[PDB]
Amino acid sequence: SGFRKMAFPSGKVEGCMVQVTCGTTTLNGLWLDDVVYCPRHVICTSEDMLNPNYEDLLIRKSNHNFLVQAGNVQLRVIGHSMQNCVLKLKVDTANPKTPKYKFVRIQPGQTFSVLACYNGSPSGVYQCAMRPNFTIKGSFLNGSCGSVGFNIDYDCVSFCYMHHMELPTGVHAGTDLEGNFYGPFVDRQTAQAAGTDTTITVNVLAWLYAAVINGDRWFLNRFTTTLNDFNLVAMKYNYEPLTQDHVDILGPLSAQTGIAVLDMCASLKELLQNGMNGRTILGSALLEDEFTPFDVVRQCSGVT
Amino acid sequence: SGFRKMAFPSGKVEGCMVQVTCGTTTLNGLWLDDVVYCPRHVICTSEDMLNPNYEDLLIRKSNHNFLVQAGNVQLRVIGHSMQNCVLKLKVDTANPKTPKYKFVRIQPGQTFSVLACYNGSPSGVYQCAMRPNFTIKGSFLNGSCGSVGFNIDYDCVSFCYMHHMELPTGVHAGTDLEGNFYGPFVDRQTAQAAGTDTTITVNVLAWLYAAVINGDRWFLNRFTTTLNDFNLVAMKYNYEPLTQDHVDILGPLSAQTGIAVLDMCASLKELLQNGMNGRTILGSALLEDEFTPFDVVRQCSGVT
Numbered sequence A, B: 001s002g003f004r005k006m007a008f009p010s011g012k013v014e015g016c017m018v019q020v021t022c023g024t025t026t027l028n029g030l031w032l033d034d035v036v037y038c039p040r041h042v043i044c045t046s047e048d049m050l051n052p053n054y055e056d057l058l059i060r061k062s063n064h065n066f067l068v069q070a071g072n073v074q075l076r077v078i079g080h081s082m083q084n085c086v087l088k089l090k091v092d093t094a095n096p097k098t099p100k101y102k103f104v105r106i107q108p109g110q111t112f113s114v115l116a117c118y119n120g121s122p123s124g125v126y127q128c129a130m131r132p133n134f135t136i137k138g139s140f141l142n143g144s145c146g147s148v149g150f151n152i153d154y155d156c157v158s159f160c161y162m163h164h165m166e167l168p169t170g171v172h173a174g175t176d177l178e179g180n181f182y183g184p185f186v187d188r189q190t191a192q193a194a195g196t197d198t199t200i201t202v203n204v205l206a207w208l209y210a211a212v213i214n215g216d217r218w219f220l221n222r223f224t225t226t227l228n229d230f231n232l233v234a235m236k237y238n239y240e241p242l243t244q245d246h247v248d249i250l251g252p253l254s255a256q257t258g259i260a261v262l263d264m265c266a267s268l269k270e271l272l273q274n275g276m277n278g279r280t281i282l283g284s285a286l287l288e289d290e291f292t293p294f295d296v297v298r299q300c301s302g303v304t
């Protein structure tokens, strides 16, 4: 037992990290097969980032201007193209460490691991959630751009995120691996608003099931509620409205614990209305929303 | 910016995980050079674990009784020996994925990454702290024994922990890679008490420096304190007493922020005496003690 904010083993992704340099800007790239994916803002200078015309900036660049280095070996760039906000550098050598992979566009509320990298070198791995407002609360410094978010299903790596920028508010924004931003963000140094973020209700409930499984049951009460009643409370506390789809995915956890989903909703309702009264749940003094029902099942059963 | 409970990239350690089977018991092993390290309780049955005589149990075992599998290839065991609570299985092939490594015995309050494994297969990575009482609050299920804790310095993996057991209280206990238990624990299914755990004061203070660096400064106040005065408060709240050595290691963070260590102690003092009043620090509603001053500096500078 015990419950931790666990990230996926990062090994398959470490073997794909490279350094991409263009002019004076260096960031991270992802080498899969004979293609290196990186944020297109690698072609910008500090002055360009205020209002960049990427098509025009890319026209001044040739294959030889993109310096791609994997560890200590230089890769030969034979093609370059822009796809939305990513650059695809065609290299002459396939990465021998290319794992089985997919590019997937995740949904808000879903979680993933981030392998934070600097100069093509991995520094740490942590588990994140794509906030309902399409931002991530990561840990990213200068040089971290091009770091990727992913999930792993047995031997298949599903890349879902590529880090592009930090909003003036300190939250992070990025794209899927086809270069499409999650949210309304653009790759430009301008004031950009991330909407009102809400708490992922289905994840908090799954984490409440994880607490019961692991012994923390103080929050369990003699009450029940309805989806409509619970959602009145969820609205007041900026929680995502709970739907029958969320109840359905909570099915396995409800089955394993024997606590009906709506009864767990009444425990969450009382926690929202009365707080924790100084107590903790799974070592946390607040309601945790970065564990999906899938994460809880995987962790609670030991899925490798 | 942003601050996350980051684990080390696990790739170097994934390449060392193997499955070790002896009789009906299967657990994880660590293959470094031509040696496989695993918990010695792999030789026990369920009845043996109540009061095992490991010397006697090992005498009934031969090299051919230890089944070591790396992925899908079987390793040939040519030697076996017990060193404290670990078994060292000499195999005929050196692991080609052996990274540069050290075996180190960490101090309580220090942190490390755990690569939780089942059947020799990695499932997730998370950052832990060796509690002052020599336990870890991990996430370990049946089959997780043999999972290791480690730190990484550029290309050198310092293994510090090997998971052995879960105490009836739900906390975890294990050994260094020479088989010596951290704490007073023995590898036996008996009631064992982990002492009174305390909060790692130097880590909370380093995490308070990480909060200031990242924008969270509400807790900063117009007060200062002395080491002796602060320690009176630390005693009352089960915090480890702060020493000049802890103040010295906080030096770099004190220098970078311009907030004297004793002034940060007065912020911590007020937080202990008055709580958080419903507020958070780095997204947490409690005082975090699993980031050492080294972790904070590394994360806040991007050390790969």
Ligand SMILES: Cc1ccncc1NS(=O)(=O)c1cccc(Cl)c1
Pocket: A025, A041, A042, A044, A045, A046, A049, A145, A164, A165, A166, A186, A187, A188, A189, A190
């Ligand atoms: C100064 C610079 C030069 C070139 N390329 C990037 C940067 N800066 S940055 O990465 O912090 C950045 C700022 C604003 C928006 C975005 Cl998408 C990225």
Ligand SMILES: Cc1ccncc1NS(=O)(=O)c1cccc(Cl)c1
Pocket: B025, B041, B042, B044, B045, B046, B049, B145, B164, B165, B166, B186, B187, B188, B189, B190
């Ligand atoms: C049932 C069994 C059989 C063989 N080897 C281990 C186990 N059980 S166990 O790993 O949960 C365990 C229980 C108590 C102390 C320790 Cl150190 C480990």
